[PDB]
């Protein structure tokens, strides 16, 4: 029994709303709202809590971090990050929460920091090879991957991907994606890393590609039903869910899921209370 949790986002401005999808009831619910309006935050499930990391409050990029206890339905502040980070990616690897890249209000970041829940402290780890704002991240096979994004040095949306090894504290480029994707959704399903949508300038992608670490190669799968950048992504019960996002002009309220056995994308019949982009998405135990 899982619940999909969707936190904040732009609809069209930063909001506090936190919605949960109950797969058994097949209904959405509003749960405890974020203490402050947020979009473009990282989102992870760790130690039974949902961590909302950084983001944008409509005015400033922030270094705040809050954790949500699904049982108590309560948000609590945790230690601020070292750096302001908005449009970062966040992931858990070996019990540490990583905040990867993003934008601090000035420039995109190659820096990365990690959070130790035992000490409630953040510390920098090795930076990425490239600055990446609007970066997606995923963990598979004990490695952390930073996928696409935007590099202000070259003013390019990125087709490159790099992988972090926590044992050596090193980032290394892996195989390049087929196309540039800033704002790609990233998920992991059946030992494959998915890069979902994104954009290259005003060109928003409906294409999706998958990466196999054992072969270090990418290939494309079925297109989504619609173009999406800044969509949230999670894996549930053998399917990959893609939540909201925008098509470059409008924020989307729809969710669609991918079935890797049928190579088909299906739009979920029940949409969120409103179209939202840049929302944090994760899955928790019910």
């Amino acid at each position: 029994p899982k619940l999909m949790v969707v936190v904040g986002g732009q609809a069209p401005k930063a909001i506090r709303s936190v919605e949960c999808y109950d797969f058994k009831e097949e209904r959405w619910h509003q749960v405890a709202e974020l203490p402050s309006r947020r979009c473009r935050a990282g989102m992870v499930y760790m130690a039974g809590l949902v961590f909302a990391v950084g983001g944008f409050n409509g005015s400033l990029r922030v270094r705040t971090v809050d954790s949500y206890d699904p049982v108590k339905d309560q948000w609590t502040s945790v230690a601020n990050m070292r750096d302001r980070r908005s449009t970062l990616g966040a992931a858990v690897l070996n019990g540490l929460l990583y905040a990867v890249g993003g934008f601090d209000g000035s420039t995109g970041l190659s820096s990365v920091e990690a959070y130790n829940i035992k000490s409630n402290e953040w510390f920098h780890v090795a930076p990425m090879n490239t600055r990446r704002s609007s970066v997606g991240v995923g963990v598979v096979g004990g490695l952390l991957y930073a996928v696409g994004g935007y590099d202000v040095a070259s003013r390019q949306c990125l087709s490159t991907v790099e992988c972090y090894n926590a044992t050596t504290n090193e980032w290394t480029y892996i195989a390049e994606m087929s196309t540039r994707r800033s704002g790609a959704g990233v998920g992991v399903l059946n030992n494959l890393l998915y890069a979902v949508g994104g954009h290259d300038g005003p060109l928003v992608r409906k294409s999706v590609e998958v990466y196999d670490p054992t072969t270090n190669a990418w290939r494309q799968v079925a297109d989504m039903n619609m173009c999406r950048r800044n969509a949230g992504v999670c894996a549930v019960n053998g399917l990959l869910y893609v939540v909201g996002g925008d098509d470059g002009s409008c924020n989307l309220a729809s969710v669609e899921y991918y079935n890797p056995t049928t190579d088909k994308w299906t739009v979920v019949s029940s949409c969120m209370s409103t179209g939202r982009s840049y929302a944090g998405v994760t899955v928790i135990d019910k």
Binding site: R40, G58, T87
Partner: peptide, 10 residues
């Protein structure tokens, strides 16, 4: 400062 994400700033 611009409210848009960095990738969207011009």
């Amino acid at each position: 400062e611009p409210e848009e994400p960095e990738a969207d700033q011009h």
